[PDB]
Amino acid sequence: EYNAPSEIKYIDVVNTYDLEEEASKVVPHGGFNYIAGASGDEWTKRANDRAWKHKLLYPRLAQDVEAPDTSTEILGHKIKAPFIMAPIAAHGLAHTTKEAGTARAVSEFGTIMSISAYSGATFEEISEGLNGGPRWFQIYMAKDDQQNRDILDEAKSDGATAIILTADSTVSGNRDRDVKNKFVYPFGMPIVQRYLRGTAEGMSLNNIYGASKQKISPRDIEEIAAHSGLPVFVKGIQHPEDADMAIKRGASGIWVSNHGARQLYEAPGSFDTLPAIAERVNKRVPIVFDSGVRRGEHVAKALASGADVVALGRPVLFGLALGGWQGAYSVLDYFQKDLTRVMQLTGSQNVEDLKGLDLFDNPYGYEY
Amino acid sequence: EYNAPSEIKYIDVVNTYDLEEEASKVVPHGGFNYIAGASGDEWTKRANDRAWKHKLLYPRLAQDVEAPDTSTEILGHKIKAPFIMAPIAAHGLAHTTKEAGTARAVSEFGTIMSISAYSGATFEEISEGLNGGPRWFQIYMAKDDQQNRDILDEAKSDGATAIILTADSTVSGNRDRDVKNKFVYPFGMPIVQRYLRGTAEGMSLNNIYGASKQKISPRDIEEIAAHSGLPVFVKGIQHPEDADMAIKRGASGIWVSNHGARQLYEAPGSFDTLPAIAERVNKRVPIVFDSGVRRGEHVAKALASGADVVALGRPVLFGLALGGWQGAYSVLDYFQKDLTRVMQLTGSQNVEDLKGLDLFDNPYGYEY
Numbered sequence A, B: 001e002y003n004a005p006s007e008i009k010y011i012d013v014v015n016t017y018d019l020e021e022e023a024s025k026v027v028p029h030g031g032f033n034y035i036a037g038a039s040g041d042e043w044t045k046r047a048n049d050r051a052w053k054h055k056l057l058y059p060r061l062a063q064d065v066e067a068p069d070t071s072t073e074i075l076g077h078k079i080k081a082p083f084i085m086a087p088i089a090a091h092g093l094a095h096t097t098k099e100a101g102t103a104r105a106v107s108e109f110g111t112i113m114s115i116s117a118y119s120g121a122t123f124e125e126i127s128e129g130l131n132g133g134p135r136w137f138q139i140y141m142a143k144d145d146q147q148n149r150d151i152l153d154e155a156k157s158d159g160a161t162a163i164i165l166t167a168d169s170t171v172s173g174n175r176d177r178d179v180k181n182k183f184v185y186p187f188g189m190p191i192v193q194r195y196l197r198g199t200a201e202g203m204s205l206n207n208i209y210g211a212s213k214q215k216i217s218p219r220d221i222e223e224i225a226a227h228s229g230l231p232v233f234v235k236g237i238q239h240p241e242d243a244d245m246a247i248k249r250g251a252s253g254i255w256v257s258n259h260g261a262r263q264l265y266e267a268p269g270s271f272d273t274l275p276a277i278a279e280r281v282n283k284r285v286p287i288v289f290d291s292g293v294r295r296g297e298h299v300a301k302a303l304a305s306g307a308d309v310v311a312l313g314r315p316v317l318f319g320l321a322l323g324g325w326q327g328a329y330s331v332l333d334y335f336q337k338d339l340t341r342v343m344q345l346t347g348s349q350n351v352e353d354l355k356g357l358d359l360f361d362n363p364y365g366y367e368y
């Protein structure tokens, strides 16, 4: 019923954009379009990408820099580069090794794995791929309090060192590709099966999101932090007022995101929202930035604009489709090498230096 | 031949502006004008004060706040309120108990004492007032590297937990009041007993600046860092490029200041420079802000604009000023209570909340 790729191999990554077309040749049509697609006619996914041309990097010369160091620290974790893996559901749509393959790439590379509540793999299967590597658990909340306590407890017992509350998906975005393809999951989701009564296999994302909590309030941020005793990120923030609210409600981190343009349509590109959120956060908690990171220049620009790290999504999954853990690893390696070049050319010896960069304002936008 | 006030008493502080006119009727004209005055016709001291009207606080309603907490932490010092004592020379111009009196106020209140290299008191006199309280030592770098080694060694033996490298005073400001008054220090500087080769009574103000290092470079920042093994603040920064330079040269903090308008004339009001510096620093190191803090609203606006703490200067000294005598522990207590009010009216439960305030841009400036 679903024949995902199974080959494991390193891949030569020239750029991450070319991975999308390459993955379209190996991933079944429905699954591929679930991964690649976005809301409406995808204008906000294009905005995520074109937003990077709004703020341009300066080359800097005679900066006394050599062999830049990409390493950084977040919430007590030293990581190889200032990027983590975003929480993404159902990795088995990309590759038979599913979340275990992604986890092995992430742990082998040296950064943090975010586990989706809508994983097709069990915590045991992901833990085998991680081999001790650090992990954060992304909760899609149950409506039932006890089921949230049980999910959180399972995640922390598996070794989670933060909780990501994704709050921007109380209902599905208008994902026209998935509507046209009548996309349903071809396998179950063991972590949230408890609140689907029946199995996620043959269900639409509309109906799984429909089972999760719609009426998320700030109390939920408080109650997740109190129960887990772990730092809580609030993910999906695009408006500075939600950042201030989340922090005052007990969040330990702000995760700036529009879900890869999969949720609200005719909204800004994610990168354009980052400065106003960073200025309102004003150093109170760490910021993770995502939605549209494709190049080392994007990592640099996010850091220069207030993000502590970025999260990587689609490009890593396309890498998993093309090579299993080694393909996914190839993408993480591409980003680290890509960033190293950009650090050398911007005069940046280390990740802190990137946070100090001035960017050129491009008022003409993409067409210039 | 200098008759400073000696009376010890609490003062009912309605506002800090009135402390300037209050004090002199022993309180000597030359010393008072040394403390109160600034460069040129004082237009930049007036700019320090009027800059607070450029960004205005909003009252915030139904914010679920009571009994705000003013406490904060800087470089692992827990302090009672987000303000420290600025390094100021020659407290004996204000009061016979000189720097020991200031130190006792600061220690009893519960914040950090900054010791000027140009103290009229020995470290042991100041230490007696501090009674184990935290202290940072402010250095005026030496041409003679041995003198830098020796003063860094005394400060650390003295229990300093940071060094303040003041870099904005390589030559004196054009302080017209002191020129017209023919002002000379009426007592010595025991801490800089090593440098002045001749006499510490017979070196007016230009010659003491003269014996110091004019040719401070980034290497000076690196060398203070390596020698002290203490965090180094670079004090006097008004331009964002100097903040980036200082951090890359090993500074552990940025101290945004124009020295109370006592140095470069026809420069911006210090508060106007703070956001560009905070944006460039982008959380890399803590920021201290000073030059013109007179009210709780000023502390709040500095925090909302990127400072971790502010430093207090002239109002605390008003140990001496014009009419009847006022400035000390009462002034620190005034600032704490004034900040508490502003926190309640802005919806701020704690110091972190102040860092998230949005300010109203007043393009009309002071006359409105």
Ligand SMILES: Cc1cc2nc3c(=O)[nH]c(=O)nc-3n(C[C@H](O)[C@H](O)[C@H](O)COP(=O)(O)O)c2cc1C
Pocket: A034, A035, A036, A086, A087, A088, A089, A116, A117, A118, A138, A166, A235, A257, A258, A259, A260, A261, A262, A290, A291, A292, A293, A312, A313, A314, A315
């Ligand atoms: C196929 C796919 C599935 C996703 N599933 C989840 C999810 O389960 N939980 C979540 O918090 N976000 C989910 N997201 C959003 C990602 O965490 C992330 O914000 C997004 O991938 C970033 O955009 P980009 O990959 O285009 O750079 C998903 C995104 C993709 C592409």
Ligand SMILES: Cc1cc2nc3c(=O)[nH]c(=O)nc-3n(C[C@H](O)[C@H](O)[C@H](O)COP(=O)(O)O)c2cc1C
Pocket: B034, B035, B036, B086, B087, B088, B089, B116, B117, B118, B138, B166, B235, B257, B258, B259, B260, B261, B262, B290, B291, B292, B293, B312, B313, B314, B315
């Ligand atoms: C009387 C006086 C003496 C000062 N002496 C020093 C000094 O020895 N070292 C130093 O770094 N700054 C010195 N300063 C600058 C202060 O540290 C501080 O930046 C200034 O007082 C802040 O301005 P405000 O007091 O008007 O708010 C002095 C300022 C005053 C008023």
